[PDB]
Amino acid sequence: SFVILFVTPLLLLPLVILMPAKFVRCAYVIILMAIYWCTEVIPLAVTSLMPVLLFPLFQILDSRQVCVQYMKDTNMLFLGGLIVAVAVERWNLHKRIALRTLLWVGAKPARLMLGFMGVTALLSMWISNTATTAMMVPIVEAILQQRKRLCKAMTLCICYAASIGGTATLTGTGPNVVLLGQMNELFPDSKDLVNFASWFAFAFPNMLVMLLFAWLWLQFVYMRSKKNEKAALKVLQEEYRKLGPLSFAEINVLICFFLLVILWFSRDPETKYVSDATVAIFVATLLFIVPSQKPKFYPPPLLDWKVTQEKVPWGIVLLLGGGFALAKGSEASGLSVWMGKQMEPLHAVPPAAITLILSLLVAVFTECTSNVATTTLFLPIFASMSRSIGLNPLYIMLPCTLSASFAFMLPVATPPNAIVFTYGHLKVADMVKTGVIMNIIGVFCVFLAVNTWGRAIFDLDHFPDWAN
């Protein structure tokens, strides 16, 4: 069974060691790492460390040129975002925001589902999508204890909303960070063309329209009620009180978060040095000295180190670094130029079809693998193709990144779906039926976004000189 998945490649190492052309060796590396990505027999971060273990033997890079690539500005940006998210989770803040929103919108099962989806998307924009599901699903259970075709709807709404809302912030989730990293590496002359501001402008409207379509679809398939308008409130309120009053530390973390947002947007409404990573580190550092209590001599802070050592996806960081290393090795060996020399005859094809086909393919493929793995595997190929056919790479690379998060079925695809299914009445057939359509929805919305307004944001109708 699962033994061949790590012993069979040993057959090829003595065959590929000689192979008097390095792009073959890099290709074998990438294929092996993909096979391990899709199969979690071995973890992900572990496989992200293969490049240092393989590029040397294949005489591609040293252990220095490759290991230097495992931490760059993107990774520390993501790390700062994660730390801020940890501060938010530490104090039951996201629960307070959630309950306030739910009580404002009202308990009307239609508007109820709308509020759940909207707040889940807004929280997922910064707050580690799985965490939001963990926070919210107990609320749904508490509601429902007070139709087997209804529980499925809201339970799926949480996960779909989270996976969608994560695509509205450049931290958000892995794939967007991967896009930023590959843009920096493959296209360094594109110094700062895809930043937090521009990408947010591109993505947030797309997120909103996808969320609208999703709410409509899930209100169709499952729901084509005075107590549940009332006895749901008596649960929301009693859960609200348990948080207690406004909890002074919550205020300070909110202020720090607002400052982060303002600094990210403001710089980009000269010999620049001050990339967004500096801002993230600014606020993350600041989150260790602030008191969390009234000084009336600051014994108490609001964030210690032990929790953030416990609660941070470092494996994700190493995963990104593996992507960086793969891109560097491909650029060095000679594989990228080779692919760009094999994808020449696509010059006759309409690019819109290319974009749509590849986005659909990625949305399908991410439903078995992880999102970030899918992205970091696919993006360099599309980049080389775009360079070859006189096309702007972003045209292809943005929709792929937005699509890699479209894991709307297969609970193994993304943890949130697993968490939702763990509570029972969400038979996988329901998930597949409701997920394929939403994959299509997301693809169409993304294509609309790229061909409508992304043009002017990124100047996609012309062939930039930063893709020679």
Please report, as ranges, the residues that interact with Na ion according to CB under 5 A: 366, 371, 407, 413-414
Secondary structure of 336-363 as H, E, C letters: HHHHHHHCCHHHHCCHHHHHHHHHHHHH
CB of 370 to Na ion, least distance (A): 6
CB of 273 to a second copy, least distance (A): 4
Question: What does the radius of gyration of the chain's CA atoms come to, in whole angstroms?
Answer: 23
Per DSSP, the three-state class of 449 is: helix
Distances from the Cα of 50 to the Cα of 87, 184, 270, 371, angstroms: 32, 22, 39, 19
Residue 70 DSSP one-character state: G
Pick one of a second copy, Na ion, none as the site partner of residue 414 (Cβ within 5 to 8 A by kind): Na ion
Distance of CA 460 to the CA centre of its chain: 23
Mask for 248-287, x = binds a second copy (CB under 8 A): -----------------------xxxxx-xx--xx-xx--
Pick one of a second copy, Na ion, none as the site partner of residue 3 (Cβ within 5 to 8 A by kind): a second copy
Report the residue number, 51 or 454, with the smaller CB distance to a second copy.
51
Told to check if 13 binds a second copy by CB under 8 A, we report: no
Q: Is the dihedral of CA 44, 45, 49, 51 positive or negative?
A: positive
Q: How far apart are CA 21 and CA 83, in angstroms?
A: 43
CA-based nearest residue to 129, from 182, 176, 70, 183: 176
Pick one of Na ion, a second copy, none as the site partner of residue 61 (Cβ within 5 to 8 A by kind): a second copy
Residue 106 DSSP one-character state: -
Report the residue number, 270 or 461, with the smaller CB distance to a second copy.
270
CB of 12 to a second copy, least distance (A): 18
Among 10, 244, 297, 345, binds a second copy (CB under 8 A): 297
- Total site size for a second copy, rule CB under 8 A: 54
Pick one of a second copy, Na ion, none as the site partner of residue 127 (Cβ within 5 to 8 A by kind): none
Pick one of Na ion, a second copy, none as the site partner of residue 262 (Cβ within 5 to 8 A by kind): none
- Interacting positions 60-79 with a second copy (CB under 8 A): 61-64, 67-73, 75-76
Report the residue number, 169 or 371, with the smaller CB distance to Na ion.
371
Told to check if 224 binds a second copy by CB under 8 A, we report: no
Q: How far apart are CA 427 and CA 422, in angstroms?
A: 10
CB of 40 to Na ion, least distance (A): 12
CB of 282 to a second copy, least distance (A): 6
Cβ atoms < 10 Å from Cβ of 168: 25
Q: What residue type is 140 in one-letter code?
A: V
CB of 117 to Na ion, least distance (A): 19
Query: Following DSSP, what letter does each residue of 119-177 receive, concatenated?
Result: HHHHHHTTS-THHHHHHHHHHHHHHHH--HHHHHHHHHHHHHHHHHHGGGSSSSSHHHH
To 10 degrees, what angle do helices 428-449 and 196-221 make?
140
Among 13, 41, 223, 368, binds a second copy (CB under 8 A): 41
Report the residue number, 41 or 251, with the smaller CB distance to Na ion.
41
Q: How far apart are CA 401 and CA 82, in angstroms?
A: 20
Among 19, 38, 45, 97, binds a second copy (CB under 8 A): 45
Q: What residue type is 119 in one-letter code?
A: V
CB of 285 to a second copy, least distance (A): 5
User: What value, to the nearest 5°, has the Cα angle with vertex 423 and ends 421 and 429?
Assistant: 35
Told to check if 204 binds a second copy by CB under 8 A, we report: no
Q: Which residues bind a second copy (CB under 8 A)?
A: 1-3, 6, 41-43, 45-46, 49-50, 52-53, 55-57, 59, 61-64, 67-73, 75-76, 184, 271-275, 277-278, 281-282, 284-285, 288-289, 297-298, 304-305, 309-310, 312, 314-315, 321
